[PDB]
Write a protein that binds this ligand. Structure first.
Ligand SMILES: OC[C@H]1O[C@H](OC[C@H]2O[C@H](OC[C@H]3O[C@H](O)[C@@H](O)[C@@H](O[C@H]4O[C@H](CO)[C@@H](O)[C@H](O)[C@@H]4O[C@H]4O[C@H](CO)[C@@H](O)[C@H](O)[C@@H]4O[C@H]4O[C@H](CO)[C@@H](O)[C@H](O)[C@@H]4O)[C@@H]3O)[C@@H](O)[C@@H](O[C@H]3O[C@H](CO)[C@@H](O)[C@H](O)[C@@H]3O[C@H]3O[C@H](CO)[C@@H](O)[C@H](O)[C@@H]3O)[C@@H]2O)[C@@H](O)[C@@H](O)[C@@H]1O
Length: 123
């Protein structure tokens, strides 16, 4: 079994992540875009982060999202102890997925990343 949780506001066009082989973001004050398996969701503002490429057997085990009307910030840790971020600003409020396995990242995006809808197993 698994579950999901949504973060952020009501704007943007919905998207579905197509896998969890790599993640990058564009960010400034907010998350301008999330780039999942090379596929860009969001706008062209901000600056491009390095790409995080998951190794064999590697998955997101902890993730913190700051959000308000948009996604402000993302950070994550993997089951191999590697970290991504934080990227973004210090606005919004923080919520965390703790001791999980992320299986799919969906969301909604326009000029910014408005929302994330994270599907995961809770351990
Ligand atoms: O970057 C790509 C582009 O960048 C450019 O910048 C243009 C960018 O500009 C315009 O928006 C910027 C900015 O303008 C105003 O100041 C506000 O509208 C502002 O929005 C805030 O304030 C309004 C008014 O209160 C709220 O309704 C908003 O929800 C938002 O509110 C948060 O932030 C406020 C300021 O801090 C706080 O007071 C609020 O309390 C609230 O704060 C909460 O949330 C924060 C974020 O999570 C958090 O930090 C806080 O702690 C707190 O929790 C706005 O950002 C604008 O032109 C915009 O365009 C969009 O709207 C137009 C007109 O309707 C559309 O034509 C356009 O397609 C855009 O809409 C799409 O994108 C939206 C975002 O993804 C999406 O929601 C929407 O559905 C559409 O898909 C724009 O992108 C330019 O240089 C440009 O060239 C460019 O391409």
């Amino acid at each position: 079994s698994s579950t999901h949780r949504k973060f952020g506001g009501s704007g943007g066009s919905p998207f579905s992540g197509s896998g969890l082989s790599s993640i990058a973001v564009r960010s400034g004050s907010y998350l301008d875009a999330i780039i999942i398996d090379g596929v860009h969701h969001g706008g062209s503002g901000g600056n491009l982060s390095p790409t995080f490429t998951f190794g064999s057997g590697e998955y997101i085990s902890n993730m913190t999202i700051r959000s308000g009307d948009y996604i402000d910030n993302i950070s994550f840790e993997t089951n191999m102890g590697r970290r991504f971020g934080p990227y973004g600003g210090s606005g919004g409020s923080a919520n965390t997925l703790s001791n999980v396995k992320v299986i799919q990242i969906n969301g909604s995006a326009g000029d910014y990343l408005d929302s994330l809808d994270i599907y995961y197993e809770q351990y």
